[PDB]
Amino acid sequence: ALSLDQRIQTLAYEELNKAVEYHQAKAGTVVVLDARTGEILALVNTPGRNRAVTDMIEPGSVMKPFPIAKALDSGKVDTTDTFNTLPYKIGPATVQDTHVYPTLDVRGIMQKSSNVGTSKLSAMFTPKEMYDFYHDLGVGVRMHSGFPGESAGVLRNWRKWRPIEQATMSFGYGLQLSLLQLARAYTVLTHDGELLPVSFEKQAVAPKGKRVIKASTAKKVRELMVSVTEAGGSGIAGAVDGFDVGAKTGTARKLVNGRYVDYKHVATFIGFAPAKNPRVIVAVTIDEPTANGYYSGVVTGPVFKQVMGGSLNILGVSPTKPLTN
């Protein structure tokens, strides 16, 4: 009846805890979705409540593939287009990357995780168009997974938005998602641009997605995302031997009385493989690591590596390129 694979479940548990202990972190979560059905194959939380469904976080940089997809789907951006990625101001506040480049093409924006570049891609759409796009991805939306305490997330209405909000949401702040809503949204990337329902039951009928982007655009985005796990990309720690992996890192500062603090982070890592035609999505978040680094790449990449590499094995998926080990 249940779609949870005990072997992936066990693997996800062990590796989650090994990372949480190692990094002296408060809490953490792993979800593993079927990339074409939305079946949950694994879902684990450090002890306590089912954080995967009940808790909402700001996605940060693991949001960025979505505005990017939107740009490309519209016809207004091509994958080769170059953008000005310098710091710029919207009223008082300033939008910037942690490493400054003067320009990046779209592929640069993904591989390096450019806040500015993502917000330049966002800025070509009306508030309504971005809202509608995030809503269609399930941001702020009940999933009816069948779990109790299901968080809807938060998606403030576009009629209310200050201009800075459009921009900050495009690179992941001022909006909130359960890790499970976030994994789900990635089915748009994996299921040829159709958002899938999520369920913990084996399903007897093909599930029907809602079309959000073209099949051609998901394909292009998945290829862009391979850059994240190769040299020059922020998720190199996440690479799995034998396979190209489309992934996205995200490190977020936390909100304490509504101001962002520089001594408290949430590390996230979501990816799928094989990149060209994925079978699986793996999502990791770890909250408030205190030892042995705080970046997505070093905190959540290794966890992802082991859960993805062990899932592909367990499901009888063969390596698509030769090992270098």
Ligand X SMILES: CC1(C)S[C@H]([C@@H](C=O)NC(=O)[C@H](NC(=O)N2CCNC2=O)c2ccccc2)N[C@H]1C(=O)O
Binding site for ligand X (CB under 6 A): 60-61, 98, 113, 115, 173, 234, 249-253, 260, 295-297
Nearer to ligand X by Cβ, of 10 and 96: the residue is 96
Nearer to ligand X by Cβ, of 46 and 251: the residue is 251
Q: Which residue is nearest to ligand X (CB)?
A: 61
CB 66, min distance to ligand X, A:
13
| Burial environment of residue 22 by CB neighbours within 10 A (0 to 12, 13 to 18, 19 or more) | middle
Q: What gap in Å lies between CA 251 and CA 297, rounded to an integer?
A: 9
**Distances in whole angstroms, Cα of residue 325 to Cα of each of 221, 241, 242:** 29, 8, 9
Which distant-in-sequence residues (6+ apart) come within 8 Å of 313 by Cβ? none
CB 19, min distance to ligand X, A:
15
Residue 273 contacts residue 280 (beta carbons within 8 Å)? yes
Active-site residue identified among 3, 61, 145, 178: 61
Which distant-in-sequence residues (6+ apart) come within 8 Å of 14 by Cβ? none
CB 61, min distance to ligand X, A:
2
Q: What gap in Å lies between CA 249 and CA 98, rounded to an integer?
A: 14
Nearer to ligand X by Cβ, of 197 and 289: the residue is 289
Nearer to ligand X by Cβ, of 46 and 296: the residue is 296
Catalytic-residue membership of 61: yes
**Measuring CA to CA, which residue among 267, 262, 264, 269 is closest to residue 233?**
269
CB 96, min distance to ligand X, A:
8
**Measuring CA to CA, which residue among 245, 256, 239 is closest to residue 324?**
239
Q: Which residues are catalytic?
A: 61
